[PDB]
Design a protein around this ligand. Sequence first.
Ligand SMILES: C[C@@H]1O[C@@H](O[C@H]2C[C@@H](O)[C@]3(CO)[C@H]4[C@H](O)C[C@]5(C)[C@@H](C6=CC(=O)OC6)CC[C@]5(O)[C@@H]4CC[C@]3(O)C2)[C@H](O)[C@H](O)[C@H]1O
Ligand SMILES: *[C@@H]1O[C@H](CO)[C@@H](O[C@@H]2O[C@H](CO)[C@@H](O)[C@H](O)[C@H]2NC(C)=O)[C@H](O)[C@H]1NC(C)=O
Ligand SMILES: CC(C)CCC[C@@H](C)[C@H]1CC[C@H]2[C@@H]3CC=C4C[C@@H](O)CC[C@]4(C)[C@H]3CC[C@]12C
Ligand SMILES: CC(C)CCC[C@@H](C)[C@H]1CC[C@H]2[C@@H]3CC=C4C[C@@H](O)CC[C@]4(C)[C@H]3CC[C@]12C
Ligand SMILES: *[C@@H]1O[C@H](CO)[C@@H](O)[C@H](O)[C@H]1NC(C)=O
Ligand SMILES: *[C@@H]1O[C@H](CO)[C@@H](O)[C@H](O)[C@H]1NC(C)=O
Ligand SMILES: [Mg+2]
Ligand SMILES: [Mg+2]
Ligand SMILES: [Mg+2]
Lengths: 996, 32, 289
Amino acid sequence: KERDMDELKKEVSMDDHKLSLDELHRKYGTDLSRGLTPARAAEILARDGPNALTPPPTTPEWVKFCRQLFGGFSMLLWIGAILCFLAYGIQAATEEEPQNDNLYLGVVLSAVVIITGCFSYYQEAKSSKIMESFKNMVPQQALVIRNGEKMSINAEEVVVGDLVEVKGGDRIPADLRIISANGCKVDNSSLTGESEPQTRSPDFTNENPLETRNIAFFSTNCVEGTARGIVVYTGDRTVMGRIATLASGLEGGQTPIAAEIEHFIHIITGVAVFLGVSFFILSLILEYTWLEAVIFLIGIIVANVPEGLLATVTVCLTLTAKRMARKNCLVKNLEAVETLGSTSTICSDKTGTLTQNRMTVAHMWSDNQIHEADTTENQSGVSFDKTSATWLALSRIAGLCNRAVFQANQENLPILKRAVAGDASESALLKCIELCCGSVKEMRERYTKIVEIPFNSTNKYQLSIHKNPNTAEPRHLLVMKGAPERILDRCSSILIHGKEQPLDEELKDAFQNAYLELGGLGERVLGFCHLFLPDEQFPEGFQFDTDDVNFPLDNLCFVGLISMIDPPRAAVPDAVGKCRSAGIKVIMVTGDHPITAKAIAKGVGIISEGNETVEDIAARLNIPVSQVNPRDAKACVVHGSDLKDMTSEQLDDILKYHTEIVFARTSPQQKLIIVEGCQRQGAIVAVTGDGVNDSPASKKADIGVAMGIAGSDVSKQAADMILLDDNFASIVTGVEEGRLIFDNLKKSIAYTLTSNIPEITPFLIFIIANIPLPLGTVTILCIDLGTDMVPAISLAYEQAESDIMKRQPRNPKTDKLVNEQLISMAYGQIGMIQALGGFFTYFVILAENGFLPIHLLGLRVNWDDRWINDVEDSYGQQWTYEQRKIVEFTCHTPFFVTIVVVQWADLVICKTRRNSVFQQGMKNKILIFGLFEETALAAFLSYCPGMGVALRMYPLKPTWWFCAFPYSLLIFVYDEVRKLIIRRRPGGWVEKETYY
Amino acid sequence: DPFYYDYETVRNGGLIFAALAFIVGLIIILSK
Amino acid sequence: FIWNSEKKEFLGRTGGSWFKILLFYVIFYGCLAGIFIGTIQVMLLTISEFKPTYQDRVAPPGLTQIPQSQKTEISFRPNDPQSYESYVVSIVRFLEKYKDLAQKDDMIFEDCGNVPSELKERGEYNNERGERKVCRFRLEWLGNCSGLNDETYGYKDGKPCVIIKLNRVLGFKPKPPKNESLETYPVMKYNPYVLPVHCTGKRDEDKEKVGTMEYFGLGGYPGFPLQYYPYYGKLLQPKYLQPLMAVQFTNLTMDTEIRIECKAYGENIGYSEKDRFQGRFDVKIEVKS
Ligand SMILES: C[C@@H]1O[C@@H](O[C@H]2C[C@@H](O)[C@]3(CO)[C@H]4[C@H](O)C[C@]5(C)[C@@H](C6=CC(=O)OC6)CC[C@]5(O)[C@@H]4CC[C@]3(O)C2)[C@H](O)[C@H](O)[C@H]1O
Ligand SMILES: *[C@@H]1O[C@H](CO)[C@@H](O[C@@H]2O[C@H](CO)[C@@H](O)[C@H](O)[C@H]2NC(C)=O)[C@H](O)[C@H]1NC(C)=O
Ligand SMILES: CC(C)CCC[C@@H](C)[C@H]1CC[C@H]2[C@@H]3CC=C4C[C@@H](O)CC[C@]4(C)[C@H]3CC[C@]12C
Ligand SMILES: CC(C)CCC[C@@H](C)[C@H]1CC[C@H]2[C@@H]3CC=C4C[C@@H](O)CC[C@]4(C)[C@H]3CC[C@]12C
Ligand SMILES: *[C@@H]1O[C@H](CO)[C@@H](O)[C@H](O)[C@H]1NC(C)=O
Ligand SMILES: *[C@@H]1O[C@H](CO)[C@@H](O)[C@H](O)[C@H]1NC(C)=O
Ligand SMILES: [Mg+2]
Ligand SMILES: [Mg+2]
Ligand SMILES: [Mg+2]
């Protein structure tokens, strides 16, 4: 009944959070001041289960090696091996040669499955290891209150319904119902997606327990303040645990590349059984007994199987994955390298993914003007003009009034990514001043703080007073920061360019609409003001305390505003740009607040400039929002509130009729629903994420992508790919890489698939016209696994034939990896020219040795007979068994060499699908090498001493080498003009029939 | 007699060839 | 999904343009075939009509037997007429070419020596000369074995006998071992113009030796007379009768199988250890009753 379990997991949650504390404790059986009794606590602790998530239900043993050994391709090679073994078994009907033939073959197939298996296994293993190295779990002991006493215990020992205290920096041990708080801001960033730290209070605020202030959450750190709470949820029963278990409980789905290969196999086995059966019938139609016909059937089928191409695909993928890793983009899974290339929709998370999830100074107000700061992680932006004195005054105000100070070990670190002990805004400001204005160390200790007023619970003004460091005027300096309206209430004078002024409503309201504009921009704004003091009234020795009014809190000099938001990562906007450019649809899915979500969306280019939401229209036109026809709106911000009441057809419509989409305030379950919703459209979805709320989403996506650092552990476990350097631009490279490796796979495949014609046909017309067998089993192997290997790999190093990031994403239904066209080329055309070359070489050798081709017909019956030692050639001479058999084996070797010769041509034309070889060119070095090593190898096997003893491969007379030559040239010249006509006429008949 | 072939020499050629053909392959993949 | 068999309008799978493609493949495969025959034709221009272009493969000719057995083995009952029938018929058709009324013509047949003689060289291998005459071989040359109509005729019915023959090679001119013959057992003094042959139980170790062997050759010499060489090939000498030499086993242990090897000696002759039929011969015989 686990279906039902997950059915309750895809549903958004409920709670008891809205209760009189009286009723709360009445329900939980607890004292609010005293917590509960130690006996009770240990009674519950052992009543259910300690406070911790059940370790990931997955611990597949290394027996999972077995996984790599099957799939579907290794299956093809398995059934191949089995068929050969059965065939040899049937050849135990007699005294039989396959001691070197069929058992040899089946064992080889097995070897390829097992070895490719081991290789892929080792790769995925290696990735898992490097992921394990990232796992550091520090125990954090929770602070409980039991029998009135504060006791700090191991967090796993916390039970349901006991008083807990959390402080600045403390992580929330389990799900709490806040009963009391002071200035308490918890960081909900990864769990709900809320960017800025949300404050927590006793009071009930929002019906949805995730947005309410009276609940605190497991795995969230309290940024500041303190709070007490009764534990509502313990362990797996908690929120992040329900998310985590949903995430563990989801399905991977078949990767696009894997499917393309499945279809590929269907084609290959299709022609395999068509040939096998049709020829089985045909063989019976002649003479051969059912025995021989069955042997031929197994023969033709097994021969159709590409043993090499399993290696050459696995290696191909591994190479691309290596480059990925070089770029600090790691793929958990091996086939997960292609998926981006096939992706038509990216669902991305906002905070920690698209943004830095770090409060940072965005814009500043100087001389009634807005100057944007550099919001980038790396400082790749534009610095403002810091020459003005107004900025100097401001910067001193922000640097001096703060609780923000750098910690002990942050020196060598970059000023941004370095840790800071303080508030959100105070951290942003501290880093900003330490960056732009130089150091705040000697700067903050330059002026000596006398008495300061920390943020009041009401009005939230924060002031402090210091002595003078300048040499001219020795008056005391006063500084204060606070919310713009309150500080506007207390401010009179305004400063410009280093000289003062009073407030006129013109520029006062200029400040007002600048504040409303920056506020509207999504940023959080802070009023910054200062006042010098009348040192005649307040002497150098006057000690002012925080009791009565010492300083004129009014008639102060308002300087300006400093606004801040968590900025997008430096690389982000350009990246979303490229993804849109490549025709991928970018959807933002965030749990954050819509007002910020929309702004960040417009900022990273998910909502382009000038595109109006339904509400933008309603606002501009001054009408009820309900009035406007939603077709008129290209972009939409969908509140999660509505997303709960939405149906299948409704979400389908939203995704259909809106080009730029932002789902804001969306629960993890709903992220999952959106992804599934983009998948109902039948499109490939990639998800990019940071925290635990992207766990179920990242799992369900065709490809998930975590963030290696700013990503959480559950969602990293859920991801099919990890970004170690946390660079969003990698996504773009990803989609490029996978888009390229698709094309190259085709090439490789085509190449190998071309060789099955000149490989299979010898054993075909051997059965048909009864000629001596032109090409053996060992030779065929030397081609499949010996020579062609290096070229078939080298093909993977082929480059982009045009700009790929220009072209639209492929259609999974239409555009196929191996399609009717490719087979029409490999088997239909090029393979045939190859076969002809092979047979030509065969006849040159036999005709030269005294058996003229016409006389070779029907000969096999006696030829293959061991005991007929007088066998008439065309000249009347008599051959023994071993003599003529040596000519047959010295006829296998040149057939093999000939295959190589025509695989030169084939490898050069398989290099390019469209471009003529004279354009794309021979710049591929591995390919050249492939040609050299290939030819060298064939030459070696022919001529190495004792190879006729070992392989029954004999030295070629030199003239032999050239028989294949014209056939190769034909292949080259043929395909070149095909790839000319295709360029010239992209109508096109050649393009429709051939281009694959 | 026409019943003798310098297989040992063609054998030698092909091998010496395979030797250069390979190490020229290696020069190529090592472009420095 | 695959239910695309036929609809409006495409024949499974897609049948609008089927003519075009088929035409294409007909043209294409036509051309390929043409090209193939082209290459095979020029290739065929380069083979000599008289001599094969490479003889180095047949270099050590082999020794063959009259009743080629399933595996080198004549196993038969002296009594049952159907026991030896297969062998008997094999021999019968083999020497059916050799009968005196079969070589009638003096136009194409030539009577050579009644005693072994020097090789008969006929011109060169071209057609400047006419179709060459062929030396006669009269079955009387093997006595007691196919004997014309005179005996055996059980063709070994009492005690086993097998004719050995030399493989035909165009141009091959056998050179018998010198009169400095390095230990060739018991043989006549007719080394000058005869390719000798001798039979043994096992090769060169201990043997289950049980055999008495009598040989019938041209004029009585256990071998091939040089007069029938060189062979001029099927074109220049059709109806060419090559030398035959018979070996009868008289004394043998009946109900036991013992192995026999016949080696042909000479400088022009060679043996391969991988090819047991190259230059030499192997026969297992068991006459059981
Ligand atoms: C005339 C015929 O020849 C002999 O056997 C024939 C059948 C069988 O014996 C084999 C060897 O086992 C078959 C085998 O089955 C299938 C192959 C392995 C198959 C391949 C699949 C692949 O992937 O690569 C090659 C294609 C041909 C093949 O290479 C060999 C060819 C040698 C042969 O020997 C030929 C016997 O004498 C027989 O009795 C007589 O009917
Ligand atoms: C051929 O067979 C005949 C038998 O028909 C053999 O003739 C006998 O020869 C021996 C001497 O070896 C005499 O003692 C017998 O009297 C002969 N009998 C007959 C009926 O002729 C003859 O020896 C055999 N020849 C060979 C070469 O084996
Ligand atoms: C790119 C195109 C031109 C390919 C050219 C490569 C050709 C010319 C090379 C590759 C393999 C080479 C052969 C390998 C075997 C040897 C045996 C040796 O005893 C004589 C030459 C001979 C027969 C070589 C002749 C040249 C050869 C056929
Ligand atoms: C027009 C050009 C490009 C090539 C056309 C093909 C014809 C005319 C030529 C080119 C290649 C040639 C072959 C290559 C070498 C072999 C091996 C040799 O032992 C006999 C000749 C033989 C069999 C040749 C016969 C003629 C051949 C098939
Ligand atoms: C071989 O030597 C013998 C004497 O030992 C002699 O009678 C015979 O004629 C010689 N034959 C040849 C061909 O030299
Ligand atoms: C044949 O062998 C028998 C018994 O093995 C023997 O008695 C007889 O003498 C032999 N015949 C000969 C030597 O002619
Ligand atoms: Mg996945
Ligand atoms: Mg986020
Ligand atoms: Mg193959």
